[PDB]
Amino acid sequence: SNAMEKLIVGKSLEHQLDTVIKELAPAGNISYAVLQFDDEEEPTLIAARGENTVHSSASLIKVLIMEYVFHLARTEQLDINDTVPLSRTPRVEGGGALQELVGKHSFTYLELCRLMMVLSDNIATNLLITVLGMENINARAEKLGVDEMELNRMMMDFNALAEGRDNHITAMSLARLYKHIFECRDRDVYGREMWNILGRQQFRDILPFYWGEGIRFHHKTGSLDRVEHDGGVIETFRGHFCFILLMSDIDNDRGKELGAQVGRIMKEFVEEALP
Amino acid sequence: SNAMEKLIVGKSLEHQLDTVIKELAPAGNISYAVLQFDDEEEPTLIAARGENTVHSSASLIKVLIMEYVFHLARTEQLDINDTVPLSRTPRVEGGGALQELVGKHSFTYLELCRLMMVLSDNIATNLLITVLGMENINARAEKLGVDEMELNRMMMDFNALAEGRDNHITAMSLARLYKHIFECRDRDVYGREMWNILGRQQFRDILPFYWGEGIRFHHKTGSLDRVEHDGGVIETFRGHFCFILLMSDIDNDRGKELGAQVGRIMKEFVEEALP
Ligand code: NA
Numbered sequence: 037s038n039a040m041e042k043l044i045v046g047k048s049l050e051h052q053l054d055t056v057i058k059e060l061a062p063a064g065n066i067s068y069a070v071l072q073f074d075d076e077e078e079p080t081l082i083a084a085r086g087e088n089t090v091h092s093s094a095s096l097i098k099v100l101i102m103e104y105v106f107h108l109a110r111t112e113q114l115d116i117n118d119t120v121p122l123s124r125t126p127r128v129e130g131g132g133a134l135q136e137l138v139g140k141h142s143f144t145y146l147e148l149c150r151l152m153m154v155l156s157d158n159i160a161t162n163l164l165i166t167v168l169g170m171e172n173i174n175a176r177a178e179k180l181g182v183d184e185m186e187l188n189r190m191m192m193d194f195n196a197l198a199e200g201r202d203n204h205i206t207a208m209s210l211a212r213l214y215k216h217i218f219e220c221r222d223r224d225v226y227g228r229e230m231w232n233i234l235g236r237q238q239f240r241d242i243l244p245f246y247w248g249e250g251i252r253f254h255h256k257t258g259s260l261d262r263v264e265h266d267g268g269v270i271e272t273f274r275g276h277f278c279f280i281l282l283m284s285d286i287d288n289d290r291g292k293e294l295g296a297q298v299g300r301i302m303k304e305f306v307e308e309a310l311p
Numbered sequence: 312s313n314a315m316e317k318l319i320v321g322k323s324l325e326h327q328l329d330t331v332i333k334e335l336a337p338a339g340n341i342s343y344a345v346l347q348f349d350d351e352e353e354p355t356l357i358a359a360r361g362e363n364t365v366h367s368s369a370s371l372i373k374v375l376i377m378e379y380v381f382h383l384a385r386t387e388q389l390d391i392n393d394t395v396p397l398s399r400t401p402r403v404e405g406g407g408a409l410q411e412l413v414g415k416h417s418f419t420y421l422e423l424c425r426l427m428m429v430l431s432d433n434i435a436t437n438l439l440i441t442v443l444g445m446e447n448i449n450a451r452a453e454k455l456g457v458d459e460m461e462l463n464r465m466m467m468d469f470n471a472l473a474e475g476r477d478n479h480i481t482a483m484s485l486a487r488l489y490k491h492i493f494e495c496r497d498r499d500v501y502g503r504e505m506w507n508i509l510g511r512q513q514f515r516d517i518l519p520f521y522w523g524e525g526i527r528f529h530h531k532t533g534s535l536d537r538v539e540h541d542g543g544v545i546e547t548f549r550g551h552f553c554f555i556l557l558m559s560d561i562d563n564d565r566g567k568e569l570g571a572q573v574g575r576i577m578k579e580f581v582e583e584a585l586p
Contacts, residue, residue, distance in 0.1 A: 133408030136425040150411040246564050289521050
């Protein structure tokens with residue numbers, strides 16, 4: 037099928053998702069996008085809702101940070117095996133492994149990207165921001181054409197949030213970032229590692245909840261008070277698909293439940309219904 | 312107010328939990344125990360189901376490993392700040408932070424207990440087992456009167472599981488181990504740290520799913536194919552209560568859903584209904 041036929045068939049997916057959103061979170065601010073990804077082709081939009089609405093990024097901005105590290109490595113501006121001391125940023129909580137450490141430790145850029153992504157480690161993230169520079173990370177978003185994504189604050193910076201500086205994303209900017217990463221996945225060792233890191237995500241409480249342990253998803257979740265997000269790429273027999281779900285102004289428990297339903301509907305649809 | 316009265320009122324809680332178990336997992340092998348904990352007093356049973364049935368431990372056996380480390384510290388048989396090289400056991404997966412590391416690293420017994428507990432880190436667990444000795448850890452269980460709990464294999468030992476060697480637990484043995492930990496919580500820095508580690512558990516997908524992020528629970532989860540467990544102690548306005556939920560022969564996703572329902576019922580009951 038061409039793109040137009042896929043879009044037409046996708047209306048049935050929009051209807052199914054909008055139905056379940058209305059049942060479970062009628063007052064939430066819920067955005068999604070479902071796209072088909074093919075090598076060297078523009079993504080094919082299948083279904084969307086509020087796909088350009090700005091949401092709190094919560095941890096999803098970490099995907100951009102990872103991309104930037106691997107870009108610097110590929111362009112020989114850093115060695116991914118050079119180390120950064122744990123001491124280089126203040127300890128913050130909110131999840132991760134490094135918050136539990138007390139001794140003298142150093143981690144490579146690789147190790148930090150890994151922990152930032154697969155366990156949403158906030159200290160790993162802040163170490164990377166500290167060493168790379170927030171302005172430089174945003175400049176990379178501009179270069180990639182995803183600058184609706186913005187990094188304006190460190191992880192766990194409560195003051196910044198209160199003073200109106202928050203990290204932001206949209207469903208389509210994150211989808212475009214994932215498409216860029218998808219395109220790099222077989223290019224070189226750096227692209228491959230980003231893809232593998234995405235696929236080793238440890239939090240499977242949202243989109244892949246019903247899929248089973250055997251189904252790899254290349255993804256990252258985000259959570260803050262009343263914000264639950266999950267977005268990434270699944271490889272299926274009918275191709276790769278990008279699933280992005282952003283949920284704001286929702287009870288956290290309800291968001292997780294809604295995201296479980298939505299991920300099941302998306303996966304069945306692209307695997308069984310979509311030509 | 313007395314133990315008999317609490318037990319009688321507790322039959323209502325059994326009925327509510329058995330009802331939801333029948334609805335969601337009628338073919339599952341589900342055990343639970345709900346107890347009230349008071350300093351220096353025998354635990355008061357509130358509600359129980361199959362509380363002496365043996366289940367695969369999945370990661371719950373890690374609680375015993377933690378207790379043994381702190382026991383060795385308290386009796387000056389080890390220094391909790393001495394280090395163990397990451398190299399000391401083969402890399403295994405199945406979750407945690409240490410599996411993502413590649414450089415030369417060392418961790419203190421303290422750091423390894425923390426990682427083992429709060430993120431269920433399998434390499435941290437195997438490092439501790441390697442250095443402390445499996446037979447010694449089981450001898451600790453016998454001394455504590457909880458030797459229905461057994462450590463027979465390292466984490467991720469596929470062969471062992473095939474050769475009939477698995478780690479085992481019962482609801483009442485785990486409850487008695489938690490009572491012991493509870494009794495140590497204010498005794499010394501080691502007891503206090505164990506209590507604090509339990510309370511920094513990062514996996515909140517079972518019993519505390521509906522509770523909200525502000526509600527601390529002193530607990531540990533476990534998961535394997537078709538096994539989902541959660542158990543720990545909650546501090547409430549009406550006292551401390553131990554909640555243990557062991558679920559075997561259940562689809563994993565359904566187990567998480569059942570556990571979320573159960574933890575909500577247990578918490579509301581002890582906070583609102585139980586005198
Ligand atoms: Na969950």
